[PDB]
Symmetry: C3
Subunit: 121 residues, 3 copies
């Protein structure tokens, strides 16, 4: 029996399968990406986040295009393979609150905080 000392690495090395994972980003996880990040991007953001928010502009701008690309994806998605998440159950009504819950604690607070700065800054 091949104790497999490292012969697999040679075969896999010549297969450069790693490349498959690189393309998978936009050629598969392209959807899960926008989500997976929001997780990794939050871990650090929580630690500390106080930039000029400039990043948002770039997003806000390109985001305009997204509504034409992404929305053109969702709109067609339901018509395409339609495979929404399995979590679906708490009705569509709560779906909105489900998000407002996490931020409810944040917004209600930060919302009044920033709004207050409006008085002077």
């Amino acid at each position: 029996a091949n104790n497999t000392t490292g012969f697999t690495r040679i075969i896999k090395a010549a297969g450069y399968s790693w490349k498959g994972l690189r393309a998978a980003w936009i050629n598969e996880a392209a959807f899960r990406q926008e989500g997976v990040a929001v997780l990794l991007a939050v871990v650090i953001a929580c630690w500390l986040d106080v930039d000029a928010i400039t990043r948002v502009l770039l997003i806000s701008s390109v985001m305009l295009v997204m509504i034409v690309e992404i929305l053109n994806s969702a709109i067609e998605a339901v018509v395409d393979r339609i495979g929404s998440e399995y979590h679906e159950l708490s009705g569509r009504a709560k779906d909105m609150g489900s998000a407002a819950v996490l931020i409810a604690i944040i917004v209600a607070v930060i919302t009044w905080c920033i709004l207050l700065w409006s008085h002077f800054g």
Copy 2:
């Protein structure tokens, strides 16, 4: 005939119906909420609003999740109970302009204002 001096308060008091309104927020108005606020949030904003916009970051970030929760709501909504607003009539084409109208006066202005600050700041 019971002149109802305050017996109703006792019955209603033991019913704590008020709680029903609290949950209704996310357990009913969860959708109308995102809208109702935009009204109350605008009344004050108009009075004065000049923060660091930091609030947006929190929104922009969580907003990424929304596209996964909300969009997963709308996409399924049309498939669920489908009950769009009754205002629907001015075609879907104008629907876009209908918004651009209110801001048309704002953007066309503020858009050139902020863009101008790009020259120096």
Copy 3:
């Protein structure tokens, strides 16, 4: 044969067809507008863009209403005349990456740049 010295201008002048193009903005291109701009708005932005991003607030706020107007348009669009772009082909999965591609170079960079400023600013 009428060499047409300028008689057309007189006829067209009395037709004020120009007005038709003005209304077409929100009465036709209302959809293409949100896109056409993003092109003209980017040409200058590229040249230079470093405002307080305040513009976003106005957008972010009104954007809340859009999800009620625009989304109510797309949701109904698929049900209305359904006429998505012809570009549709690279599957809906890549549709997400298709955008992440352009910004992939930007975000991956600016994302780490602004996040870094979090350390001090």
